[PDB]
Design a protein around this ligand. Structure first.
Ligand code: NAP
Length: 243
């Protein structure tokens, strides 16, 4: 409902996705949490609870049930490279299918259900088509994720696109978070961010109107070189880019 949003997080058994899922449950006062995962193993990993759905984002009908009644969507799905030390994408699970098409299906499902807000987590690197990450498993992962991002900006639904720096497994809430445009943070040594702060930014974007129709790159300052971001109003306000 307008005042108690049902928020679906997809890739909810993912590393960032599961922090988003728990934070929607921990604070299941301001939100009703709902998770989408790819397998029964993923669903059990996260508590196996009733608000978790199983589906394949490359099969639009298999994910449609999860979208019923939702108010917001946080997309935390990604094509994931597999190792045979050389990396490859499983068949029909390339960034084209998973990140472009897989996300297209979420976005289309969400418009149907009348979602007020879709948040998507992506990656820095998308202003440069020759970026090293695109070579990984011959995928063009950043190209396809950008396509999904542009498709989301295009759809008419209020959106927040979060292009994270290198993901860290470090404590959330303890860093100054930095917000950039067009990969500019990649010139710095502040171009990486804990998974738990990306998760926090997804949830915060839900709470502030200043986050709607914004696209930014997300980095952080090392813990101890500044005061932790506590004021997300100010943070979102410094963004002016729509893409
Ligand atoms: N790794 C980095 O340092 C880096 C840097 C910048 C940005 N990012 C971006 O940040 C985001 C979050 O990263 P993360 O490492 O926390 O994510 P992650 O652990 O790799 O999780 C991605 C999730 O997507 C799910 N998924 C993949 N294909 C699916 C499909 N066929 N149907 C349903 N679910 C599917 C995976 O399911 P399973 O559990 O079943 O595998 C997984 O749970 C990603 O978009 C990533 O591109 C990553």
């Amino acid at each position: 409902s307008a005042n108690l949003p049902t928020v679906l997080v997809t890739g909810a058994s993912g590393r960032t996705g599961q922090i988003v899922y728990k934070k929607l449950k921990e604070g299941s006062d301001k939100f009703v949490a709902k998770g989408l995962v790819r397998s029964a193993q993923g669903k059990e990993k996260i508590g196996g609870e009733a608000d978790v759905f199983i589906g394949d984002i490359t099969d639009a009908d298999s994910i449609n049930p999860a979208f019923q009644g939702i108010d917001a969507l946080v997309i935390l799905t990604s094509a994931v490279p597999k190792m045979k030390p050389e990396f490859i994408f499983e068949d029909g699970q390339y960034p084209e299918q998973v990140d472009w098409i897989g996300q297209k299906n979420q976005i289309d499902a969400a418009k149907v259900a009348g979602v007020k807000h879709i948040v998507v987590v992506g990656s820095m690197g998308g202003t440069n088509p020759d970026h090293p990450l695109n070579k990984l498993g011959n995928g063009n992962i950043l190209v396809w994720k950008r396509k999904a991002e542009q498709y989301l900006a295009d759809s008419g639904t209020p959106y927040t696109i979060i292009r994270a720096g290198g993901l860290l497994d470090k404590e959330g809430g303890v860093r100054e978070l930095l917000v950039g445009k067009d990969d500019e943070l990649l010139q710095t040594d502040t171009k990486t961010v804990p998974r738990a702060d990306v998760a926090e930014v997804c949830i915060q974007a839900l709470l502030f109107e200043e986050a709607k129709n914004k696209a930014f790159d997300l980095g952080s300052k090392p813990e101890g070189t500044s005061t932790p971001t506590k004021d997300f109003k100010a943070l979102f306000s410094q963004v002016t880019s729509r893409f």
